[PDB]
């Protein structure tokens, strides 16, 4: 058992947990959150779009590790890293690599509102009713203290008052004054 594990110097920010990604419901809720952190922390963030499944160390080892080492490059200049990962739907899905990303957990406080969200997306997402509520339940079955940042706020500004201030408390933790 090694006591120290080579992690990046600035942890990559990940947004997840509303429900299963790969849908019009969960992704378009997160796409509003990537827009807020783009211009609020402009010049001190690196926001990327993730394609290959990084829960593997499908894709081979080389195509994933060359993207993991790109996250290793984005920790060298001591700035924020943000990931648009499209298959991450579990806390322990990213527990075996050497990244340890920031688990921002979007919390839908009421499970009945999700399937009302589902019937607002037309009949395309109305064919995918109970399949989204599975990992919407399983992430709600996971303990909230295992996560990092919890967002239970319906309005934009109240989910974003936590989403800006927590990492601003995290930036001053990483960076000391002169």
């Amino acid at each position: 058992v090694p006591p120290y594990d080579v992690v990046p110097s600035m942890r990559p920010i990940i947004l997840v947990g509303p429900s299963l990604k790969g849908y019009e419901v969960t992704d378009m809720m997160q796409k509003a959150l990537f827009d807020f952190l783009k211009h609020l922390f402009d010049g001190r963030i690196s926001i990327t779009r993730v394609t290959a499944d990084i829960s593997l160390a499908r894709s081979s080892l080389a195509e994933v590790q060359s993207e993991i080492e790109r996250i290793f490059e984005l920790a060298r200049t001591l700035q924020l890293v943000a990931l648009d990962a499209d298959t991450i739907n579990h806390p322990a899905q990213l527990s075996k690599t050497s990244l340890a990303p920031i688990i921002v957990y979007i919390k839908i406080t009421s499970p009945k509102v999700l399937q009302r969200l589902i019937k607002s997306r037309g009949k395309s997402q109305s064919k995918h009713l109970n399949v989204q509520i599975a990992a919407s339940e399983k992430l709600a079955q996971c303990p909230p203290e295992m996560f990092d940042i919890i967002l239970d706020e319906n309005q934009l500004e109240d989910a974003c008052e936590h989403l800006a201030e927590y990492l601003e408390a995290y930036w001053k933790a990483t960076h000391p004054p002169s």
């Binding site: 919890i150 239970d152 706020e153 109240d158 936590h162 201030e165 927590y166």
Partner: peptide, 14 residues
């Protein structure tokens, strides 16, 4: 909204 808003404060402050 008194038993909710300051419970959003009890999470952030710790």
């Amino acid at each position: 909204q008194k038993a909710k808003a300051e419970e959003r404060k009890r999470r952030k402050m710790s």
